[PDB]
Amino acid sequence: DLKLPRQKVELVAPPFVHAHEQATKQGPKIVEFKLTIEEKKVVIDEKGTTFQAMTFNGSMPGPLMVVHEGDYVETTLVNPATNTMPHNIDFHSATGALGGGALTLINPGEQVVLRWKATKTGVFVYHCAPGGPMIPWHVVSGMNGAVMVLPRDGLNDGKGHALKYDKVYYVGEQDMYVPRDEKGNFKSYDSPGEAFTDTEEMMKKLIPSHVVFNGKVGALTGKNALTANVGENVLIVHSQANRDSRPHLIGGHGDYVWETGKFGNAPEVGLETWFIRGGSAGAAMYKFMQPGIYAYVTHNLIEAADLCATAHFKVEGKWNDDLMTQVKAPAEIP
Amino acid sequence: DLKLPRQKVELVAPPFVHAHEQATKQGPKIVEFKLTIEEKKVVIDEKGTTFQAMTFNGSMPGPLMVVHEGDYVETTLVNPATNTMPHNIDFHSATGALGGGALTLINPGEQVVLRWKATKTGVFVYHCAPGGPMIPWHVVSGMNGAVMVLPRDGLNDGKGHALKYDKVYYVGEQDMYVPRDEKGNFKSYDSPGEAFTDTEEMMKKLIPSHVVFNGKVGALTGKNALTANVGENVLIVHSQANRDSRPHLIGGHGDYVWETGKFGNAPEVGLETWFIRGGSAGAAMYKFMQPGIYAYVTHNLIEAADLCATAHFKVEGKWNDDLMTQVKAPAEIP
Amino acid sequence: DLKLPRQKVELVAPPFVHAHEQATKQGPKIVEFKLTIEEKKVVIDEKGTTFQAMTFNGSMPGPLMVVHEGDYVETTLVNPATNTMPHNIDFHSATGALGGGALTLINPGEQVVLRWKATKTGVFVYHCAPGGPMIPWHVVSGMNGAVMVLPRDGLNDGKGHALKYDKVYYVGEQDMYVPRDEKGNFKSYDSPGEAFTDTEEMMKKLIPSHVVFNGKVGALTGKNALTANVGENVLIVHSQANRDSRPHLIGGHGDYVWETGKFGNAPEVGLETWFIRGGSAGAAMYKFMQPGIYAYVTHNLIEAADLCATAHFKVEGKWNDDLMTQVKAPAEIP
């Protein structure tokens, strides 16, 4: 009865984002996505700690979905019979029925199809929300992601100038609550159900054991470092479904930042550190001016260095000695 | 010596707000309020946990006081002889003498009358502040509320368009610190004085046992759900006197949000989640587009689902299938 | 090879700031600063608790450095042979090499000279960042400060009006993690190295034992209270290198606030409480309207009253009874 063109999207695993246009001359479409729920035991640190994860599409965070204002987003959610619990999905971008949660509850072996219209621009969290105490548990187990709703004319700086990014990365931050046993070692469990009681007691004390980007300590380092070149404008979309974060690009800045993540508001300029409110996504863009390694962290440094929340960028290009120079290398005090 | 008309206001218990005009053609007046302090033992959860509360007017939060810019606010504070401690009041809206705290200290059996001029627009916290370690203790025991200072021309969106609300609710969030005994059960006490030592040890660890709206788990649910109709513009004023909050309307948005709560600043538009800094009030307005149940939470979901911080709205009207529709109900995976 | 005038600055201990111009007709210069690292055991509370501090120039926070946009900042960092650890410096104001950290690592007995161009206006954190788990440890041990980069035309309100301050204070907030022994008393250590293991276990639980301004409970009270007069416009620069803060002037307001601390963005007006994101500095200006004592706190009141985070201002001048008056002094309830 809704007669618009349909467009399928192939989702990609974070931190990458599926191909999309920024400004577009296409009119509204129905954009179709499929998410499949996967419950699974995963390793979250280099010491081999395990965790009962629950995920959209097998990843933490779930994939970024990108559409334009006025599109209709049609999502098929699938809960395979290999899963043990009911799940649903709530989009913060959507209007009514608890963001879709009241219409998408599915047992193992079931699927559902929800359509919502993208009336509000920005980046938005989506997450599972099955009811009661299950809501935080599914979220901190990894069932969250984000959706970016672009203006049809693309991003602007609030003073009439277009802002175009050369690439976009999605960094999903996850607070994790892994109980310890009497000796002080992290416990492992055979099922999410068995993890539940001990995990809930710890959750209610509000202190995470780990805070990670892309699901694991070191996920966005080494071979999997983010990349750019001097002169490239990079958009970083950052979500946190449950707890605040304070992103910071070490050696860089946020040239244009939407910290509340909504493109109806002009961005702030020239930030050192920005703030992502728990239950929200934000976006920052930076044009790289210098080559080398940058670290992207939450600037609670204990969380960054000791609990897992650090990514790297490797940037290629030519060093600018006007911006920064070692005048005198380390030497003995005269 | 100040010769203006006087107007008495009858305060009402939150989440309701006393009757007031938005835009007004009245000039400045002296607006007169009375607050009576009540210390009392209250039940804060459905398991029957008790708490030594200290309150303005018998409620947590204290009532919302509404005036216009340039009014003089004259408050009579009364500390009846049935109370055991000295109290005072500090308004964040007021200028000088620690917001009035240095002029309003009263023992049981005493009253005081303070007048302050409302020179700054917005929503503002008020709270008891008797001195030293007593300050946090009285605040987290429930002695806080808010005052809304409207522009004489009412609210605007910062682009010259009037914003008028059809109704306003006041949601006061309270972090509570209830000690546990050796077995792990919540302790009960005979007086606020006796609760003091154990409560202070726990407070300094910074983790609340409960986080509640309107004084109790479930206070704004069931028969006491907030209400609206499709098409109504509702203002939600949210205060937190001690600890940050991240309000979120599940299934809705903040169409216009003053997250720092001050109407000299234009509102932000189209937010999913906003942030109320500890020691502040903010305000968000939303026009309901869909009927059904909405939940208003802090989007730390552990706090929302497990520690008490969830309210409901029941919205009447007609479902809009253009905004959202279940394309295919839950069914077996083909 | 860079041929500009050189200007030496003599740094002063916080909360004071070295002499500088707001608006200037000078062109770019190379401004030269020297920081000397001092590791030392210090007393942080009135009960005599000690702490293994690590500092720039012997103070917590390190001194505020003030320059103008387009200046080149040339810093000599000195790590004397009396220190035990390597140190470096990272400026959030600077571009490349992890803010300078990758170019400034020095062992005891060494110095280094870094130059960076001040391309972004605002207030910015600087801090030590030696690598890995050392990063949070050096920061929460006291190795942080701030640098203010002014526009050449001085500050403005975003509507074309100049904002000039009559004085500026720098308040550095420090979260400290002091372990307790079995009896429940704070432990003392002989070296930062020996403090490391116990301090790290406590840090990772994320709850500070103390939160202080200027290095010590009560540092900015009594004889060392901040001062102003009625009619004076005072700028307060506030930094927090690791953990969020929510500054509030009790009895006053923030007339003009840059809470993200960056002068490319217009200030917000008329705030009660503002928010400093961990890893950032912000700035607020207020014109005092009333004499007397004001307290400047973080409005987590437990932190303010019980953990150390309270400063005082003593303001001289004439009381304005129009703004506030005690109509009726405390008296028996009729």
Ligand SMILES: OC[C@H]1O[C@@](CO)(O[C@H]2O[C@H](CO)[C@@H](O)[C@H](O)[C@H]2O)[C@@H](O)[C@@H]1O
């Ligand atoms: O960046 C958004 C900000 O820019 C303004 C102009 O100052 O409006 C621009 O962006 C709007 C939303 O994308 C466009 O609809 C408008 O046409 C464009 O000028 C502000 O209104 C807005 O807050």
Ligand SMILES: OC[C@H]1O[C@@](CO)(O[C@H]2O[C@H](CO)[C@@H](O)[C@H](O)[C@H]2O)[C@@H](O)[C@@H]1O
């Ligand atoms: O919403 C406040 C915001 O709007 C502006 C206009 O952009 O001013 C409007 O609101 C002021 C405060 O209410 C009024 O005094 C003014 O007349 C009206 O245009 C901004 O100045 C202000 O930040």
Ligand SMILES: OC[C@H]1O[C@@](CO)(O[C@H]2O[C@H](CO)[C@@H](O)[C@H](O)[C@H]2O)[C@@H](O)[C@@H]1O
């Ligand atoms: O306060 C900064 C804010 O003011 C505006 C004008 O609204 O620009 C002013 O400040 C700029 C940065 O200092 C100046 O370069 C400009 O000349 C001056 O009008 C905004 O553009 C800015 O966000």
Ligand SMILES: O=N[O-]
């Ligand atoms: O070893 N169990 O707590």
Ligand SMILES: O=N[O-]
């Ligand atoms: O039972 N008292 O801790």
Ligand SMILES: O=N[O-]
């Ligand atoms: O007394 N040592 O924990």
Ligand SMILES: [Cu+2]
């Ligand atoms: Cu789920």
Ligand SMILES: [Cu+2]
């Ligand atoms: Cu949500």
Ligand SMILES: [Cu+2]
């Ligand atoms: Cu009191």
Ligand SMILES: [Cu+2]
């Ligand atoms: Cu206060």
Ligand SMILES: [Cu+2]
């Ligand atoms: Cu160091």
Ligand SMILES: [Cu+2]
């Ligand atoms: Cu840093």
